[PDB]
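Annotators were shown the component list below and the corresponding predicted structure, then asked to write short factual statements about the assembly.
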Amino acid sequence: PRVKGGTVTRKRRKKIVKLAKGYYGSKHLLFKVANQAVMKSYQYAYRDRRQKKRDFRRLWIARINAAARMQDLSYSKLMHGLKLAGIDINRKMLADLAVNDIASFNTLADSAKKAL
Amino acid sequence: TSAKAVAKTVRIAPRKARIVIDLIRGKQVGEAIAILKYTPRSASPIIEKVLKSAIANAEHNYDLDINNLVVEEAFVDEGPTLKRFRPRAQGRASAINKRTSHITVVVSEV
Amino acid sequence: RTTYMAKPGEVERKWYVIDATGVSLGRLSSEVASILRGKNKPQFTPHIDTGDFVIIINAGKIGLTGKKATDKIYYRHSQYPGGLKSRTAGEMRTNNPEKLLELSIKGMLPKNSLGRQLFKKLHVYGGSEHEHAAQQPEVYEL
Amino acid sequence: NRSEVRGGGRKPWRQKGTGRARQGSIRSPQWRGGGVVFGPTPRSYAYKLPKKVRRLAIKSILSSKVNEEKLVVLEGLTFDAPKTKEFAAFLKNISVDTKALIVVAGESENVELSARNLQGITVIPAESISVLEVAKHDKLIITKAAVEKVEEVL
Amino acid sequence: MYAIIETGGKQIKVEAGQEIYVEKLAGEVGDVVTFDKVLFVGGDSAKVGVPFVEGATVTAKVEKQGRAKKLTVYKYKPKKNYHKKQGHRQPYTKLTIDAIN
Amino acid sequence: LHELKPSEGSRKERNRVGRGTGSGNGKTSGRGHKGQKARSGGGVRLG
Amino acid sequence: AVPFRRTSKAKKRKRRTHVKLQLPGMNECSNCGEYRLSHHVCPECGQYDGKDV
RNA sequence: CCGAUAGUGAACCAGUACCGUGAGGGAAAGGUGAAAAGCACCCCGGAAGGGGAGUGAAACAGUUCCUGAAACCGUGUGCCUACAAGUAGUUAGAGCCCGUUAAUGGGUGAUAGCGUGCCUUUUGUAGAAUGAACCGGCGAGUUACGAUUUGUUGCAAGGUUAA
RNA sequence: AUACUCGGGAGUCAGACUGCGAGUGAUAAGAUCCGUAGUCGAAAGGGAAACAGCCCAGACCACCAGUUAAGGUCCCCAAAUA
RNA sequence: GGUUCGUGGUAGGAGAGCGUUCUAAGGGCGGUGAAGUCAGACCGGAAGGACUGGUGGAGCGCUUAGAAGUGAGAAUGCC
Ligand SMILES: [Mg+2]
Ligand SMILES: [Mg+2]
Ligand SMILES: [Mg+2]
Ligand SMILES: [Mg+2]
Ligand SMILES: [Mg+2]
Ligand SMILES: [Mg+2]
Ligand SMILES: [Mg+2]
Ligand SMILES: [Mg+2]
Ligand SMILES: [Mg+2]
Ligand SMILES: [Mg+2]
Ligand SMILES: [Mg+2]
Ligand SMILES: [Mg+2]
Ligand SMILES: [Mg+2]
Ligand SMILES: [Mg+2]
Ligand SMILES: [Mg+2]
Ligand SMILES: [Mg+2]
Ligand SMILES: [Mg+2]
Ligand SMILES: [Mg+2]
Ligand SMILES: [Mg+2]
Ligand SMILES: [Mg+2]
Ligand SMILES: [Mg+2]
Ligand SMILES: [Mg+2]
Ligand SMILES: [Mg+2]
Ligand SMILES: [Mg+2]
Ligand SMILES: [Mg+2]
Ligand SMILES: [Mg+2]
Ligand SMILES: [Mg+2]
Ligand SMILES: [Mg+2]
Ligand SMILES: [Mg+2]
Ligand SMILES: [Mg+2]
Ligand SMILES: [Mg+2]
Ligand SMILES: [Mg+2]
Ligand SMILES: [Mg+2]
Ligand SMILES: [Zn+2]
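Structure shown to annotators:
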């Protein structure tokens, strides 16, 4: 029996074109450039899931560095202080204290100064 | 309510018809007709008949007031192309598209 | 998730007046670039502009260590053939000190649209006087 | 295939210079009305397993009908004349209700005609009892006379 | 008052009545979860752990055992005919925080 | 006839080459790159 | 000599920003009560505005 | 076995049209509706075409008239856009607009970080090497008979028939 | 914690650079030809501005967690104006 | 059922599968709307599969098995 190409090709290409929604011009209309755009969007998204974790740790560190310099510590001294003090609060949490309750952050920086 | 008129499959490339239809879109029908009368294009007399048909339809089928009518919509859609050939140099034949237009005009009371 | 992100206008941009008298051109510049980018605030958000306005006064007295006054050359190209002009840092400190500090600091700001906004927050003066008294600027120490 | 399709023969245009893809026949398989590349060729699909396997199979499918109380054995099965009404009445007496293979062997006459116009029901002499025919039928109705004939072969 | 607790190899700031998503805990929809690992306690009289504030628990009730919105993980190497699509839905537990102690 | 289960291992699914790179037999369809053994009807005679 | 790349829809549309007609310079008449080109004779009245021809 | 690019070259006035001095080459092109009930009449228009009215289950079934995808062409408008250097996304992300197969939702995207299409061929290609204007269809390890090896099943010092 | 033997199925027979040891060359070549180790090829990630072949190091998937390698810590740009 | 060691990959070997047309058997859907087509924020580790609504107006799934003209983005491919 003969099997004509019917429906499966259209169904597969239309899914890919839909994943390219929002892309500039031909990249959201045409299967061939849509398919490349979607492949590349996934590649970037895989890479950026690793880069996002690095990005946020750099943002926290910058904010802790700021909050610690208002206490006459640098980030390098404060984090050394906390390690010696035994405090295990991570950078995402310190960065949040350094924005939301600076009183608490100053208490931790006090503990740090004491350990040094 | 609003009145429609369409001239389907007019020999007149859509681009050439759109450049004129763009002048009337949203005007009062009185003014629109004057714009078509003093716009010296091949599209002008064709678009005028569609627009005057729309106004007749609006006056006879829907008893609307022809003194209070604005062109609500006016657009040109591509009709089926007549495919032709022009013999060029070196025995070669280059394609000619004798394009057609669907001219739609919609008048609305306000 | 939960990391704070400054919104435009949220963080209070303050006005600082910095006396440049006898500080290395860099050394002055690197500190100011930090104040402009708002790197000294825990509210620092890399995509916003949480930084302060900076007025530099006495830029004619900025310091140039070694032979930089005669040997540090600032280049401009018009984009016409052979259209390369040069000025010495010393000549430029004497005549266009405003321009010397602006060049110096413009190189230590991010090279993007936000970096171009930051540079608009910098006000350099050859002498000791500015006309920004209305912004009630606070003295800042390096 | 490309040899059997009408025409082709000539190169459609010269190998080089025209700026077109090289082509050897308007009936090459990538052309619209061109030859198919492989595709069906008339062949037989028939094959037999060894005789002892084919016997084991018929014995096994029979034993499976007995294991499921699907085999009914009639003393005899005869109709004075072809009458499908009479045959349908017969099946209601046996309580068949489903598809059923009827296996007779001489003596029984007018049975084939009586049951020819019933949709589920198939009638065969005892000589023709095949695995596929028994597999295609829920119940197996066989006369005693037939049973002897089937045991004579197996 | 708010606490910093170590769950799922991560730390989160919790206030009473807050809803948090964490890495999948053992629990049924209603079960009370306890957090023995409390790094810090906030408000008046701050308590700093060294590490963990001795005898400090955060008690939460389990609101939902779920899998996150579908992610597609796709990798390819140009010119090497290599592609690998893989779906992912990270399990989570929704908690409502009862009380810091 | 609606629950035929042929003997386990008695039948396998044939390998189809040149149907995509996911299968591992896409493109060159197991022949590798170029030379006489990559060509249709290619292959030196037996010995 | 020839286009290196096809022109995109956006780019083609930007080039045509200026390819358009201007409205005719016309006003209503006094006599006719109808529209006419300034400095032309009005054919509805069959004359030059109100000045008879 | 095919189901209108398939199946004959040819479902249709096809070896036709068309091409060629000639031998010869050789297409494209199926579908209103159950029934013509195939749109009286009115209206704009020279007509074409249309809008009503009417027929019909449907006319967005209106004499090339089942369905009617994509490219491509338009109209409308929610978000953005005229200091910007862009493989066009991706991650972070305000603001504004929405509200779903209701779930750590949808649209848009100021601004920030990161980021050299796809394929082929190569020691090595973003490649200033090859191929593709776009979209759609079609388009490449098959079958026969032998050989060999693995698996399965039957029987077993036997096994098996061919015509 | 592999090895060997027997079978079924391959692909490969253009290699590249770096270090070390040689030849050819001019003790030239991103040269050529061997030996030997590595990486690339067929390896993404971090560093070396960018940079197959160098330094660090091997990506099963998710995380707005942590520690380290090379390389870094005045600003661009995370960390010492130690 | 658990511990331990693993899980970059081209040519290539091995395995398990998705989907297409057709057949058989069984069991179903469908003018209270089949296939197709359009849309969507659903489901599965992938190939892929549903559900709902529009269009459409008569056929089509599912299960087990079988058989293949069985899957296209590239051929200066053909139309
Ligand atoms: Mg880390
Ligand atoms: Mg001529
Ligand atoms: Mg021939
Ligand atoms: Mg060309
Ligand atoms: Mg044919
Ligand atoms: Mg297989
Ligand atoms: Mg294989
Ligand atoms: Mg392979
Ligand atoms: Mg390929
Ligand atoms: Mg090849
Ligand atoms: Mg070779
Ligand atoms: Mg080979
Ligand atoms: Mg045909
Ligand atoms: Mg068709
Ligand atoms: Mg139609
Ligand atoms: Mg500017
Ligand atoms: Mg602007
Ligand atoms: Mg180029
Ligand atoms: Mg080309
Ligand atoms: Mg064999
Ligand atoms: Mg060399
Ligand atoms: Mg060597
Ligand atoms: Mg190679
Ligand atoms: Mg690498
Ligand atoms: Mg780099
Ligand atoms: Mg490469
Ligand atoms: Mg560390
Ligand atoms: Mg820094
Ligand atoms: Mg690994
Ligand atoms: Mg692997
Ligand atoms: Mg079908
Ligand atoms: Mg095929
Ligand atoms: Mg194509
Ligand atoms: Zn007048």
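Statements collected:
1. The helical segments of chain D are 51-67, 84-94, 111-114, 131-135, 144-153.
2. The interface with chain F takes residues 135-136 of chain D (CB under 8 Å).
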